[model samples]
Target chain A: FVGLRVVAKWSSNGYFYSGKITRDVGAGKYKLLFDDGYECDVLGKDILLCDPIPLDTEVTALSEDEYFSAGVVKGHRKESGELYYSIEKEGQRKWYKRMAVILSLEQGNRLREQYGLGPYE
Target chain B: VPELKQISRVEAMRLGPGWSHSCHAMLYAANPGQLFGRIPMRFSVLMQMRFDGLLGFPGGFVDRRFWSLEDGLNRVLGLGLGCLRLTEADYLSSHLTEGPHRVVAHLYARQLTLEQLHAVEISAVHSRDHGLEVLGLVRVPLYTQKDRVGGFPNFLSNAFVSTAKCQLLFALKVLNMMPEEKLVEALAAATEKQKKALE
Candidate 1:
């Protein structure tokens, strides 16, 4: 399962850390390489399988002028839990849920479409 | 906690970090002897045992950066079928990864007139990871209504990982092996059984 990314709950930190399983260290243990460029030995039991964000998902966000705008998700910052998208109108790219933009509508739509979220006013 | 509503349907997808992708195969074959489902068991009996000696499909982690879905599935299938008699290429192809675990699983089914599902046992026996990563593979009981009528509700009463159960039901429905309505009925019946047992 090398190269398989995982959400691992680190025992020491007592918080969930996301990383990629780089190697098997025997005895149901694995070596996890985190997005922060650090590595740790994690038990296989602590690893939880999770889905990766797909590229090119449709998203919506508000511009500085409060106009309804749309964008396509380009990538993500795994460690930061931030989504990066490109706006079609001005070709703007920025992190989601940031103060720079209001993603109330498009964000709602994307969440509803992708994760089966219900209506949010 | 977040709220959940019963929608018509939902797509299988995920985003954000703290996730690792794993792939599994719901390999099924049928012949005169019996209709066989290939389920492997993990060797360790730790508290984190999600299935805990319960049966599950044959599969493992899939790395998208390294290989495409098909290739990654085949790679895992080969490892799972290492000691088995059948070739990894012999099974059908799959792409959809629908399940509750959030891990993508490629479903594959084919007819095997000569290959016995019990041969899966041999695969595990000779498996290089025997007694290590995997205990062995077991044949899932299908086609027979062991308890209650020929309803899947009873058959599904057996211990299994929650994701595996959902995958099997999805596989059966997609394969036309079980009708959607019957499955729903069975699910209801299973729920009732659990309710009464709890009482």
Candidate 2:
């Protein structure tokens, strides 16, 4: 799929995480909704996201602020100053480093034991 | 608590400079049945940069009963607090004095807390801060004292191609069969880095 690609691997923190694109409809008049049930109407055309939502539990459409700010949070190449968060919007190839965090080994176990994920093992 | 690792999008930058980004990772299982037909997972990577020109960990002590550590890691974040924010880089850059429940070497290298790790993981899974656009205006020294010794790490060295630009090159290598230089140019435009990786 063009959206998100899940990778199976060991995190520095044994907890495994997954990958997916934030909900984007690809630049046009659109509406975005978060899992917490907050929805916003996007006006200025930036990146257009796809429709009908996905099967995942959490999703939110990108706002102008969210779309343009890069490296606001530091990780890995950790340096403060000039705050640049990572970004990989629609129409881009591969994943960019963003504000990802480690969830839990339990979640990894769920994916592995219950869901048959091998990224752990 | 398990250790968590992250690759930053700012450094990995796929779009132009200053584009908003969220952390992402992939989940996996060995068998098909467990994943409910192979359902993948996604989460954000939260990490604190080295403050005060010193390499220290992100986050600090949190009240245990309320699980504020988890909350801080989820949305607000603990790295930008008073202690972490106020403590000089001299205090943070060095290794921790021998103490109980020592953090992992890599974790120490990354300058984050064990509690921060645990909380970050949980929040990442549950999506407490999914795709959230967090903004903080802070000053960053383009040149580091590290450059004074052993030179800067390859990841931050400007002479090298940015991760995002490399990704575009890799895409071109796979998708367009374009020359490496052409891919570099395309990626530079996309990422808004210097025109040439060599430059």
Candidate 3:
């Protein structure tokens, strides 16, 4: 594999974040540009040949409440092949469409600020 | 959770033994300046939900031949708390398990500033183990509250995994976070909840 589109260990929480290989960092390491605008060189042990996001991937998505919140992949539209998720705060299940906005980490925190909520831990 | 031996840090580290070992830690920060109402914020300690849905410290098994206790713990922390590093100096205590595959569980701790603690928390949002091995970080309630037992002792009764309860109590006593008699009363009170007028 040329390692174009792959998942690399974010390492902060040990969960893999999907990213694209930007440059081969030599000696079996590749510099990955995450979908969230974060970049780092990850070794092969931390790389995974996979899709952009998985069925149960944890992501930060824009909520219908005019804010951003944590969410988990629930299901995908069979025809459009787009994913939907369950926004995880406020003690109730809330759904969003194809995550019309799977905002990057920076963008997600920006909206979290708009609503006076603490940063997503 | 069977009968096990409690050994010194020196003897425990000398485990030519233990079928295997696991390491976990308690990361805390001094919050001297922060206060909630009238009570002072002594410190905030870190704990997380285990994969089995029980509350415990953030640590896992360390394969002896492959990774050192510190390395394995850092590996766990890297996946769960970003790139924070820990050394042997942070080692706290170790406990031997009583099961067939005996486990030498090591616990470590480090006191940091509030900034350092939260930085680790913030980085964790991007870590790989959140939805897998860890639920997220939960701050320990250091005080017993004016009611005398609501805060700390009530939490002491939480469903903790393995040797977490004893280790947690030991740290509080060893770290000078609480008075022995006070903790004794709490633990005594906590034991009562399990049986008829216990402790």
Candidate 4:
């Protein structure tokens, strides 16, 4: 999985907003992304919108030399045919979000692999 | 429900055994190995059985070598083996353990079921060959909830105690060793109900 910085952007009604967009979980379930590290359950059924103001587009594609310093940089594919990119936002505050989000992803994926997540009313 | 204070996961682990980050809950085991060791399992099963003539759930101490906990529960209950539908999730959420791979040994006594009454009875009957103590079906059923709550059969509240005292008195009479002073003291400190019972 790759770590990329994505910003929570405004939609059509955007006058202004000052929050961040973070990948919710790192690996599993449905290509899941989170808003500012929110703990709310994310599944493939969740809609991913392009932020009005994207976070960090400067993803240094993972390489052997960059492995230790930059972290894994790759798009993760899910059984649902969705892809996710894991990115680390540099600031200390965002570091927590990054780790939490990655953990969420890994656990989500593990669960899906064992018992597939489904649509529940 | 009582108001609960919230804490973090680290705090939860620090709160010691059976504490968790989720809502306050109790851990239960249907089998042994659910705890750190088998000791708690034996205590959990034996104590309640000793103090009260009630049966707990079908599961008992787990012998992890033989099978999974659900299977153990099935064997103990004398149910034919196969896929006993109890799941790991059910055990994990309810049993008295946390973390990975470690068996939690908490007995969720509140979840005691009716099925156990017959099993204990069966064991008690079979105990005769092994010179084990057998307990007969309770002759005195506890009062119906409504009666206890409404206080209809007020005497029933002291029924067990009265029976025990009567047995003690009978033994004393047989031995010709009545303790008159103790009897007088009992009367002096008697509750209204006890006085009425004696009268």
Candidate 5:
């Protein structure tokens, strides 16, 4: 459990917060130091160890499928096997098939330009 | 599904119809207090026996057309939580995908502190999505000094879904948690007991 990154749900709002498993406090409980620097004693049961998120990836919308709206990679749904992204048309997030979407050269260039870099071959 | 095959780990990742892929994680936790001045590595494997009320790992069918094997396995990791309010974005990687079968099983190992492991155990049984379907989360015993006849060989002598048992055997071997000979013996004993009951 040491050094394993995990997520604990916020009882106040039910949203999960990310953190790494810290020292055990005894009786199946441990202190969690969250990513945002907040720490708390969390029950092991209340924690859902997180899957690594692929963030800021450059991708385009594949289909008109509402779930996989084309844009920047936001996150994804494992239960549905869909890839989520930031959509231009909807101005919100959605998921889609990885095949349906292709890598966006224009977006890639723009991000590179931001860092004074150029596009790849 | 045919019996587990000894195919190249590389072949297991290829998308194909001859095989249907699934993934499951075997999470382990270690006690903090040391035994013999060394943290006792008494590791317990976390297993989620779902929908069928039979023992198995927490994972489901993989659709390669939708995602890479890695992504697919990651997705299953979250979905296995039953009712837990979490998603794939919440976990981390340990072992990469491995196993062999038409219903290929990818085994993942996530180590948690003993305390955190305890919480997972409690939540698994009581709060999973289909509470009734999730019989409970069980610990596969990893260390027992009892004569080879008394421990896992005896505990695993009970009924298990064929695929799940096969997956467990594969993971146990990869992790070096059990000896191959003993696992074979345990499985043989279990199968023999079944045959006797049938007779």
Candidate 6:
């Protein structure tokens, strides 16, 4: 509902596409704004979602060298049919798995605790 | 899937001390119309992304130490519900988690008007917990699509936290929002998809 990545269906073509819910319009309906600036109202049923993080989300990423750096989400892509995000760090956008796109260092450390991994030094 | 018995709050409380209580809810709204002529007669079901990276409902460990379950649920859940409060009457069901540390997993279902649902959804974006706790909201797919695999089945393929899946399934049946017949097919299709994903 909020800051979520959604695939919304259009009544005309009946095809679901990536977009952002801009506002609430009618009963159980949302106004979706596509990347190209086109907007339309759609029923809540026509919207499906994945991870909540959207483009331009600020996150921390772990580098191959075990260093953590800040990044901004550019968008999402699929690799082997699995969803991954394109996160921009140091002016270059690279792919990151969901787990790697840490929302906060504390959150990252908590996940590390689950995996029996040491916290960041 | 495990069969979750619906226990009353009195029975839940009698489960004894040391049994932690986790309160969650399934929020929904009735749809005035369908997406098409035939299928996807969906109700707007609200879901959230947890800090543990799983999709779950809003609300968390209701700190009975400080406030009542309902009070804490509303506090932790910063979604702007305005004056709409969920009392014990909103309690849908409760499940017992098998472990040395028993948890009385409580499920509540709160139905809002379409406009009210829409208002809260929009407010959630600007809510305090929007980022770390309540990452986002969702609409549970209640129908099978043209391909027969896209809607409910595909949604089932995604992971849910703890007893949330069973709770949802049970609620769907109990609330009569989604039929149990189509749900069984959805479950089977989702299982196949999960199997293929592993293979």
Best-performing candidate as measured by TM-score: 6
Docking class of 6: incorrect
Residue-wise C-alpha lDDT for candidate 4, range A58-82, written one tens digit per residue? 2222222212222332233233543
- Name the weakest run of 10 consecutive residues (lDDT summed) in model 1 chain B: B1-10
B-chain TM-score, candidate 4: 0.26
Better structure of 3 and 5 per TM-score: 3
Per-residue lDDT of model 6, residues A1-121, tens digit only: 6455555444422333445777867567778764323355666655655354567756666554445677888988877866677889889988876444544523222222332111123
| TM agreement with the true structure for every prediction | 0.46, 0.18, 0.56, 0.21, 0.46, 0.58
2 against 6, candidate with superior TM-score: 6
Q: Tell me the TM-score of candidate 5's A chain.
A: 0.43
Question: Candidates sorted by TM-score, descending order?
Answer: 6, 3, 5, 1, 4, 2
Model 5 lDDT per residue over B1-199, tens place: 1234343345455434434566566677665454456434356777766776577777667677767656776555444553222234433222212211124555556667777778777655555354655666777765433455344655576667666676677766766766887677776765666677788
- Per-prediction DockQ comes to 0.03, 0.03, 0.01, 0.01, 0.01, 0.01
Model 2 lDDT at residue A49: 28
> Model 5, stretches more than 4 Å misplaced?
A1-121, B1-3, B31-41, B82-102, B126-128, B143-150, B195-199
- Given candidate 2, what's the lDDT at residue B143? 17
User: Which clashing pairs does model 6 show?
Assistant: A1-B137
lDDT of 3 by residue, B1-199 (tens): 1223454655555555323577888889887754467777687888888778888887787776666779989988888777679999999777655322335678898988899988888887778998888887788877767776677777766788857776777887789887888878887666665555354
Candidate 2 wrong stretches, greater than 4 Å = A1-27, A41-121, B1-57, B60-150, B153-199
Candidate 6: misplaced stretches above 4 Å?
A1-121, B36-39, B79-83, B98-100
Q: What ranges in model 3 sit over 4 Å off?
A: A1-121, B1-4, B8-18, B33-35, B98-100, B194-199
- The predicted structure with the larger TM-score, 2 or 5, is 5
Candidate 3 positional error at B158, Å = 1.0
- The global Cα lDDT (0 to 1) of model 5 is 0.53
In model 1, which runs have C-alpha deviations exceeding 4 angstroms?
A1-121, B1-19, B34-54, B83-102, B114-116, B144-152
The Cα error of candidate 5 at residue B188, in Å, is 4.2
Error of 6 at B152 (Å): 0.9
Q: What is the clash count for each candidate, in the order shown?
A: 5, 73, 13, 22, 20, 1
Q: Is candidate 1 or candidate 2 better by lDDT?
A: 1
